[PDB]
Design an enzyme around this catalytic site. Structure first.
Site, PDB file in Angstrom:
ATOM      1  N   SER A 285       0.821  -1.209   0.000  1.00 30.19           N
ATOM      2  CA  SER A 285       0.000   0.000   0.000  1.00 30.19           C
ATOM      3  C   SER A 285       0.861   1.268   0.000  1.00 30.19           C
ATOM      4  CB  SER A 285      -0.922  -0.012   1.224  1.00 30.19           C
ATOM      5  OG  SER A 285      -0.199  -0.344   2.399  1.00 30.19           O
ATOM      6  N   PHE A 286       1.912   1.248   0.814  1.00 29.79           N
ATOM      7  CA  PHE A 286       2.851   2.361   0.952  1.00 29.79           C
ATOM      8  C   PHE A 286       3.403   2.845  -0.391  1.00 29.79           C
ATOM      9  CE2 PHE A 286       5.175  -1.659   1.282  1.00 29.79           C
ATOM     10  CZ  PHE A 286       6.213  -1.472   0.361  1.00 29.79           C
ATOM     11  N   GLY A 287       3.686   1.896  -1.278  1.00 30.24           N
ATOM     12  CA  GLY A 287       4.228   2.216  -2.585  1.00 30.24           C
ATOM     13  C   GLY A 287       5.020   1.041  -3.127  1.00 30.24           C
TER      14      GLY A 287
ATOM     15  N   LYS B 117      12.722   3.797  -2.265  1.00 30.30           N
ATOM     16  CA  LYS B 117      11.306   3.677  -1.953  1.00 30.30           C
ATOM     17  C   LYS B 117      10.566   4.755  -2.756  1.00 30.30           C
ATOM     18  CE  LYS B 117       7.868   3.736   1.809  1.00 30.30           C
ATOM     19  NZ  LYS B 117       7.557   3.707   3.276  1.00 30.30           N
TER      20      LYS B 117
ATOM     21  N   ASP C 277       6.751   1.358  14.390  1.00 28.08           N
ATOM     22  CA  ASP C 277       6.805   0.076  13.702  1.00 28.08           C
ATOM     23  C   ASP C 277       8.113  -0.646  13.964  1.00 28.08           C
ATOM     24  OD1 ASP C 277       5.745  -1.996  12.238  1.00 28.08           O
ATOM     25  OD2 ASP C 277       6.517  -1.249  10.313  1.00 28.08           O
TER      26      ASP C 277
END
EC number: 2.7.11.26
Lengths: 25, 349
Positions: free
Chosen positions: B31-33, B50, B146
């Site tokens: 989802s983040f990329g 990223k 996280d």
């Protein structure tokens, strides 16, 4: 659905009580 | 082919440079990329890139955070550039981070499959550095949210650890609410499960205690199957929280009645040969009361790490231990005087 279930346990105020129940089954 | 872009140095003067890379390849999705891995054409060095979709109007939480950060136990942002978005009000930010294929997770899973346990020396070395990075990012008010074995990079020869993946990180501001369903299940603090939105960066310390406990046990300590099972796993060790503890975690949660279960002995949570001081440290990290958890610095100064402060100490392979006492003012800010305990008189320059 556990998110909802959690959201309800938290809204209802039965999170600890419920977790303990499961802890015994 | 050889890709070339105009990028800005992560830590350093805002003036662009060209940057060519190659052997690019996707190594992660979600989802983040998207995440790729590549090689720098003039540095040879391998890096991770990223690529996130960002809304032009707003700033990028991750990018903003990585720019303040310049620490040895934190993955360094080499460069960052942008890419043509598709929808006019969207761009793709490209964080060109440093690449290390080794993680405390892989290592730990290695020993686990070999049925033995990670050497105490490494447990002290890794956990120590983890705390410094925590101490450092927290000094800015930044919470990683996280923390877990997979987000801990390792240099197999130097034994250096770096915190990475600040995708969930956020600069916390008291009074401003934060999402409560954050952080990888197994590492999620009790208050997050109880719906807290007014939590502090001490949820990172709870997570660290979980990583520690995992290294000692050989597998995650609280492998909950859901959010409710997570608390059940926690209760199995800490028993049920006291009302005072619940108030502390979430001032707004109410439960009029619930059965009270006592906690099991930490001495029995772990195997018999587990070094006592590791257990002791662990008990001060995995606490229900957020404010009661040790701070990263206090933890770095814990008796469990005394051996790292010994002049003779060396790695099981004769090598030297990474930089463990190059603390900065920023890093020590929370309690500057502890500096005298963290920094061995045999390291003073």
């Amino acid at each position: 659905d556990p998110h909802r279930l959690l959201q309800q346990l938290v809204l209802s105020g039965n999170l600890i009580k419920e977790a303990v129940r499961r802890l015994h089954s | 082919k050889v890709t070339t872009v105009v990028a800005t140095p992560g830590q350093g003067p805002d003036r662009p440079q060209e940057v060519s890379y190659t052997d690019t390849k996707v190594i992660g999705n979600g989802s983040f990329g998207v995440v790729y891995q590549a090689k720098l054409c003039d540095s040879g060095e391998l890096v991770a890139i990223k690529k996130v979709l960002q809304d032009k109007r707003f700033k990028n939480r991750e990018l903003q955070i990585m720019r303040k950060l310049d620490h040895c136990n934190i993955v360094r942002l080499r460069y960052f550039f942008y890419s043509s978005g598709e929808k006019k009000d969207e761009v793709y930010l490209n964080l060109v981070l440093d690449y290390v294929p080794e993680t405390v997770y892989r290592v730990a899973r290695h020993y686990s499959r070999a049925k033995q346990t990670l050497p105490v020396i490494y447990v002290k070395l890794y956990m120590y550095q983890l705390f410094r990075s925590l101490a450092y990012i927290h000094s800015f008010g930044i919470c990683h949210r996280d923390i877990k074995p997979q987000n801990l990079l390792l240099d197999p020869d130097t034994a250096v650890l770096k915190l990475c993946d600040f995708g969930s990180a956020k600069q916390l501001v008291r009074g401003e609410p934060n999402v409560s369903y954050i952080c990888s299940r197994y590492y999620r603090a009790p208050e997050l499960i109880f719906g807290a939105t007014d939590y502090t960066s001490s949820i990172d310390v709870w997570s660290a205690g979980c990583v520690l406990a995992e290294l000692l046990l050989g597998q995650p300590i609280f492998p909950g199957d859901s959010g409710v099972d997570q608390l059940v796993e926690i209760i199995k060790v800490l028993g049920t929280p006291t009302r005072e503890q619940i108030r502390e975690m979430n001032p707004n949660y109410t439960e009029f009645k619930f059965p009270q279960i006592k906690a099991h002995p930490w001495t029995k949570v772990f195997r018999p040969r587990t070094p006592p001081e590791a257990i002791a440290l662990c008990s001060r990290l995995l606490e229900y009361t957020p404010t009661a958890r040790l701070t990263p610095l206090e933890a770095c100064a814990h008796s469990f790490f005394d051996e790292l402060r010994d002049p003779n100490v060396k790695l099981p392979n004769g090598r030297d231990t990474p930089a463990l006492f190059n603390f900065t003012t920023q890093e020590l800010s929370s309690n500057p005087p502890l500096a005298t305990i963290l920094i061995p008189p045999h390291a003073r320059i």
